[PDB]
A and B are shown apart, each in its own frame.
Chain A
């Protein structure tokens, strides 16, 4: 026996059933270019995650509203959606979970929030800043564009202390240019 054999792992996306549907290809490319995604895989995993959330809500809604499992897990699901900024305190019902869309999840990405908070010039500029270790969520540097920000953490997005844009020393391009200028 190897202990490592007991480590779990799973899949995070499914490919479309119809690969060459022109309507779908048009809608997906619009979301990919709007949010600066790397490929269709990034959009497919968000759809995969959304399907899981909606499926959980549908099962709960099919039970009696007095069912203890309906009450307990329903509150947990609503609490989870509120903590990430998907739902509002005025939408505290499982029926509002079924009304969520892919755009709601893509708007909570770190890449989207870095752009819509003014830190970046374009959605594609935010992508490079995140992966280049210029952003931090609170005290922690985050270099994953797919990081899903929480409502309690959205106000702490700032430049990293080690970045040239956050108080750190200038990068190696300016430093070399300064060195060359000094040599003159």
Chain B
């Protein structure tokens, strides 16, 4: 157990997407990594975020030898703006959306079966 200092660089406020974007530098001596959950709890305090769900951290790479990691962070003005501009998979990670389980190959075979029938029977084609 040691200190965990978080440093940000290449910072810029993005009005077009209503967010703050930056690179995250995490110094974590004596620790394997820092979980994305804990980094959100710490970025919400360093930038005074009312709702941490507007925080997205991804693409973390621990440097060779340990003791330091680098990632990318996004702070959205609100969770509503996040759900508009954020990709679906990054919303599922933060719990802001669910995952619809589907098979792409099954969808293709249904498409090819459904175009041999005309009218309202297209859907009922098993």
Min distance, Cβ A147 to any Cβ of chain B, angstroms = 12
* Tally of chain B residues near chain A (CB < 8 A): 6
- In the docked arrangement, what's the CA distance between A136 and B68, Å? 15
Q: Which residues of chain A have C-beta atoms less than 8 A from B95's C-beta? A: none
- In the docked arrangement, what's the CA distance between A179 and B2, Å? 25
B66:A140 contact, CB within 8 angstroms: no
- In the docked arrangement, what's the CA distance between A136 and B64, Å? 11
Q: Does chain A have a CB within 8 A of B71?
A: no
A162:B66 contact, CB within 8 angstroms: yes
Q: Provide the A146-165 mask, 1 if CB < 8 A to any CB of B, else 0.
A: 00000000000000111000
Chain A, interface residues (CB within 8 Å), range: under 10
- In the docked arrangement, what's the CA distance between A154 and B64, Å? 20
What are some 11 contacts across the A-B interface (CB < 8 A)? Answer: A133-B65, A136-B65, A140-B65, A141-B64, A141-B65, A141-B66, A160-B65, A161-B29, A161-B67, A162-B66, A162-B67
User: Apart from A141-B66, A160-B65, A162-B65, what are 11 other A-B pairs with CB-CB below 8 Å?
Assistant: A133-B65, A136-B65, A140-B63, A140-B64, A140-B65, A141-B64, A141-B65, A161-B29, A161-B67, A162-B66, A162-B67
Interface of chain A, main secondary structure: loop
Q: Which residues of chain B have C-beta atoms less than 8 A from A133's C-beta? A: 65
Q: Which residues of chain B have C-beta atoms less than 8 A from A140's C-beta? A: 63-65
B residues in contact (CB < 8 Å) with A: 29, 63-67
Min distance, Cβ B3 to any Cβ of chain A, angstroms = 14
Q: Chain A residue with minimal CB distance to B29? A: A161
Q: Which residues of chain B have C-beta atoms less than 8 A from A162's C-beta? A: 65-67
- What are the 8 A-B residue pairs with the smallest beta carbon separation, nearest first? A141-B65, A140-B65, A162-B66, A141-B64, A160-B65, A133-B65, A136-B65, A140-B64
Q: Which residues of chain B have C-beta atoms less than 8 A from A161's C-beta? A: 29, 67
Min distance, Cβ B48 to any Cβ of chain A, angstroms = 31
Min distance, Cβ A165 to any Cβ of chain B, angstroms = 15
- In the docked arrangement, what's the CA distance between A162 and B29, Å? 9
Q: Which residues of chain A have C-beta atoms less than 8 A from B64's C-beta? A: 140-141
Q: Provide the A76-99 mask, 1 if CB < 8 A to any CB of B, else 0.
A: 000000000000000000000000
Q: Chain A residue with minimal CB distance to B30? A: A162
Min distance, Cβ B60 to any Cβ of chain A, angstroms = 18
Min distance, Cβ A130 to any Cβ of chain B, angstroms = 13
Q: Which residues of chain A have C-beta atoms less than 8 A from B65's C-beta? A: 133, 136, 140-141, 160, 162
Q: Which residues of chain B have C-beta atoms less than 8 A from A141's C-beta? A: 64-66
Q: Chain B residue with minimal CB distance to A133? A: B65
- In the docked arrangement, what's the CA distance between A161 and B63, Å? 15
- In the docked arrangement, what's the CA distance between A86 and B30, Å? 38
- In the docked arrangement, what's the CA distance between A177 and B29, Å? 26
Q: Which residues of chain A have C-beta atoms less than 8 A from B66's C-beta? A: 141, 162
Q: Which residues of chain B have C-beta atoms less than 8 A from A160's C-beta? A: 65
- In the docked arrangement, what's the CA distance between A161 and B65, Å? 10
